């Protein structure tokens, strides 16, 4: 499904990303926007054999298992298929593990290039949450 801006905002908040390890809700909304345009089925095959799945494009070389990637590790111990559901639970749970690393959100390239440093608060602007 394709979430609406405020809808995802309310969703991510209920799923507890707002101010998770210091990252404001806007950061997560902004990242989802540039990473997948709020599409839970967003999929991208990378030069190697990995693929990014979900609203946050989690990679199949490190975080999830898609059965066709060389050197996979499945750190989130989840099928890559579960990161495509309309229920963002698994996607949020994995994202929390990812950001809990030293380089935090920098793990999301789209976020670095388009959200990092910017006033991401505008992304939840206008939402009554």
């Amino acid at each position, epitope marked *: 499904k394709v979430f609406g801006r405020c809808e995802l905002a309310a969703a991510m*908040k*209920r*799923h*507890g*990303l*707002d*101010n*998770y*390890r*210091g990252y404001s809700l806007g950061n997560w909304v902004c990242a989802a926007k540039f990473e997948s345009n709020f599409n839970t089925q967003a999929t991208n095959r990378n030069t190697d054999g990995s693929t990014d799945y979900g609203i946050l494009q989690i990679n199949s070389r*490190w975080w999830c298992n898609d059965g066709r990637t060389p050197g996979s*590790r499945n*750190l989130c*111990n989840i099928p890559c298929s579960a990161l495509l559901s309309s229920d963002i*639970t698994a996607s949020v*749970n994995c994202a*929390k*593990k990812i950001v*809990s*690393d*030293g*380089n935090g959100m920098n793990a999301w390239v789209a976020w670095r290039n388009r959200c990092k440093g910017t006033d991401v608060q505008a992304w939840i602007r206008g939402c009554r949450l």
Partner: antibody, heavy 113, light 108 residues
Framework: EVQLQESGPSLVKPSQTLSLTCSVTGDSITSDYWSWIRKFPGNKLEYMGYISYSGSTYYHPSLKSRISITRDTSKNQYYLQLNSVTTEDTATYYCARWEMDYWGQGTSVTVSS | DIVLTQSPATLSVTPGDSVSLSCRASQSISNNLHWYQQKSHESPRLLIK???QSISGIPSRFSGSGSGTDFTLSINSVETEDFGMYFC?????????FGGGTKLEIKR
């Protein structure tokens, strides 16, 4: 499924450094996030710290930079080293996976001269 | 740091009846609150993660609810092996911290 187990001296002297080993089976050490939690005699639990994939670690400020958490290069075991201990460090130490799902049985260590 | 307070520190219960355990945070932590069961000579066992997400192999009688600063672990129809120590812990901000715990003991 993964299995974990702590091991190291049960007695450590004040000012000496405390070291413990956590052996893991069922999942690669470099393939995950690992933790150390301690439980004091009064039953209170303290989260000591963790190391993640980039090799980055997070230590609890309550430890005043006395803690070091390292992973072995090839044995599939990570370690806990705590400097300048006192009797306040007397406790049961547990290593567990960051997921908080799998824990080691826990091992006791007393600090006394 | 975020302080987690659990009250009462001790709770008496009669097998068959239900109980609710409280865990309050000094700061809102959203859903980043987990519940553990700990028996003597044993490591903590994870019961519920992220305030209400259930864990595989945990009796369905255990359930968690709450958000922000007020959380609750519910044990429907308490059984003999449910007795021991219950702790809550937050992972919203570093350092992760634990609540002081609530003792679940047998009423007689």
């Amino acid at each position: 499924e993964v299995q974990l187990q702590e091991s190291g001296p049960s007695l450590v002297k004040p000012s000496q450094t405390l070291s413990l080993t956590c052996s893991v089976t069922g999942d690669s050490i470099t393939s995950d996030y690992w933790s150390w939690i301690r439980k004091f005699p009064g039953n209170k639990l303290e989260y000591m710290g963790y190391i993640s994939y980039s090799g980055s670690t997070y230590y609890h400020p309550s430890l005043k930079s006395r803690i070091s958490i390292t992973r072995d290069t090839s044995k599939n075991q990570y370690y806990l080293q705590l400097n300048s201990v006192t009797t306040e460090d007397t406790a049961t130490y547990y290593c567990a996976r960051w997921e908080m799902d799998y824990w080691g049985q826990g091992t006791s260590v007393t600090v006394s001269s | 740091d975020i302080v987690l307070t659990q009250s009462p520190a001790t709770l008496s219960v009669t097998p068959g009846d239900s109980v609710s355990l409280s865990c309050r945070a000094s700061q809102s932590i959203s859903n980043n609150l987990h519940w553990y069961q700990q028996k003597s000579h044993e490591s903590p066992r994870l019961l519920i993660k992220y305030a209400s997400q259930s864990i595989s192999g945990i009796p369905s009688r255990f359930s968690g609810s709450g958000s922000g600063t007020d959380f609750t672990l519910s044990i429907n129809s308490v059984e003999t092996e449910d007795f021991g120590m219950y702790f809550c812990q937050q992972s919203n901000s570093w350092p992760y911290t634990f609540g002081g715990g609530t003792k679940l003991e047998i009423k007689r």
